[PDB]
Structures are given as C-alpha cells and as structure tokens.
Amino acid sequence: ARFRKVDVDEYDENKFVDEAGPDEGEVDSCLRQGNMTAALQAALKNPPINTKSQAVKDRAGSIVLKVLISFKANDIEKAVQSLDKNGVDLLMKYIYKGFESPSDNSSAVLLQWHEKALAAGGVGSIVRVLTARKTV
C-alpha cells in the first residue's frame, strides 16, 4: 500500500554523513607578464574545496581552465614538474572538471595536460580525484 512510498531510511540515524578560489588578478598578471609556470601555481592556489557554491567552484574552475588553455603545448611539462604532489593532485581534479565542459576544442588541450599530470602524479593522482569527499 501507501506506507511503502516513504523511504524511512531517509531519516535513519546510522546513515553516514560527510563532515574562495585563486587570485584572479594574481593569475592574469603572471599570464600577462609571461610567467606561465607562476600562473599555474597562482591558479592552483586556495581551491574552493570547502564552499557549497557550485558557482564559486565554477569560477575557480574557469580561472584554472583559462591558464591551461593559454599554455603552449611544449611548455606544459616544465610547468607541471614545478608542482609538488599536492599540487599535481589538485591540477588533476581541475583537469577532470574541465572534461565536463567541452568548448571550442578545450578538450584537446586538457588531454595533453592529463598526459603530463599523469606522468608526474601517477595513476594515484587519479585515484585521489575519485576518493575526494570535498572537491572542486
């Protein structure tokens, strides 16, 4: 009957419960001034990992994405290699988020970045993308 339409599990008490962005100007400046590797680092700075706003997350994503597009193919490696592991990890999460919004040909470049991030972070950096409870 009618009492089965309500998912009592919804209010179950045992059920598990999980526990701003980069400096726009900082980034554009490194870009404008040609400091590519510095721009990547600035963009990977302070991720929205703790805000419930898909909006701010999207801005962070766009900022990071912008940088990744600016890069000249032959420069991607050198830049990625400048990052520490926590950095490569974060970069990987941003690369996966990019994958969710193909534009012009942004995906072609995101795949090259993925090649590099993978090379520096290993398959384990991808793992940590899937394992994250708080993400970009």
Partner 1 sequence: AYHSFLVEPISCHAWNKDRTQIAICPNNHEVHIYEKSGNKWVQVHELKEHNGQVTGVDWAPDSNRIVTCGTDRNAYVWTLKGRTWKPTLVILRINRAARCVRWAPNEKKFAVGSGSRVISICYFEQENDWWVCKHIKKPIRSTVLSLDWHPNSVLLAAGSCDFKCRIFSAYIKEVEERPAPTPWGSKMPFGELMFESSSSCGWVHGVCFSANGSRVAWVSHDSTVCLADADKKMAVATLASETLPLLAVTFITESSLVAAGHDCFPVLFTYDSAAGKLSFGGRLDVPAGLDSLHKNSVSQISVLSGGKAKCSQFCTTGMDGGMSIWDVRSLESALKDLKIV
Partner 2 sequence: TATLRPYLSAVRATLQAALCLENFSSQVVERHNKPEVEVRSSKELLLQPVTISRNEKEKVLIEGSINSVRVSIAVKQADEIEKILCHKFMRFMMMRAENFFILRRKPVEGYDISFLITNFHTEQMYKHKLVDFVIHFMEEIDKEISEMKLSVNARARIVAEEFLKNF
Partner 3 sequence: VVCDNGTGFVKCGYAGSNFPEHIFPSYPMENWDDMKLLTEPPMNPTKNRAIQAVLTLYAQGLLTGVVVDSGDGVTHICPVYEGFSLPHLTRRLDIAGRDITRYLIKLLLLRGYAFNHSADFETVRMIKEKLCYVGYNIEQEQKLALETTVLVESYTLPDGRIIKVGGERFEAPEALFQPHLINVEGVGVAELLFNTIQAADIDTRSEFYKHIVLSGGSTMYPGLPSRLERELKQLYLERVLKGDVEKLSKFKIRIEDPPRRKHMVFLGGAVLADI
Q: Which is nearer to partner 1, 79 or 89 (CB)?
A: 89
- Cβ atoms 79, 42 nearer than 8 A: no
Q: Which is nearer to partner 3, 7 or 84 (CB)?
A: 7
Contact between 4 and partner 3 by CB under 8 A: the answer reads yes
Contact between 100 and partner 3 by CB under 8 A: the answer reads no
**Which residues, 1 to 40, sit near partner 1 by CB under 8 A?**
14, 16-19
Both structure tokens of 82:
């400048």
Q: How far is CA 60 from CA 20, 23, 42, 66, in A?
A: 8, 9, 11, 10
Q: What distance in Å separates the CA atoms of residue 23 and residue 67, rounded to the nearest whole number?
A: 12
Q: What distance in Å separates the CA atoms of residue 7 and residue 104, rounded to the nearest whole number?
A: 44
Task: State the minimum distance, in angstroms, from the CB of residue 66 to partner 1.
Answer: 27
Q: Which does 2 bind (CB under 5 to 8 A by kind): partner 3, partner 1, partner 2, none?
A: partner 3
Please report, as ranges, the residues that interact with partner 3 according to CB under 8 A. Answer: 1-4, 6-9, 11, 13
